[PDB]
């Protein structure tokens, strides 16, 4: 799809449209997302020991 419609403050279409960027046509890779998200969620962690 070339364009995406821009909606107004009232919820109705304004009449202006924007072109969808190329990042929305990128590959969708669940294996990549899962691998990064597993290590990403570890990066906030705060150490514990006895």
């Amino acid at each position: 799809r070339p364009t995406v419609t821009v909606f107004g403050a009232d919820g109705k279409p304004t009449g202006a449209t924007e072109v969808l960027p190329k990042v929305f046509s990128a590959p969708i890779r669940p294996d990549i997302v899962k691998h990064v998200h597993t290590g990403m969620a570890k990066n906030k962690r705060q150490p514990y020991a006895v």
Partner: protein, 52 residues
């Protein structure tokens, strides 16, 4: 949405990756006029009748 093209261009050392598949709709790949014209006749059905 205007900036989305720019922020992904300004990322050095990275470009928008090329997919290994151009048409991800597999039904179009298989149920096409070009593929279906060249196939062999079907050797059987989905359910095989018990012979003996």
């Amino acid at each position: 949405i205007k900036q989305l093209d720019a922020v992904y261009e300004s990322k050095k050392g990275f470009f928008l990756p090329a997919n290994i598949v151009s048409q991800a709709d597999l039904s179009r790949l298989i149920n096409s006029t070009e593929i279906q014209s060249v196939l062999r006749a079907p050797k059987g059905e989905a359910r095989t009748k018990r012979a003996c």
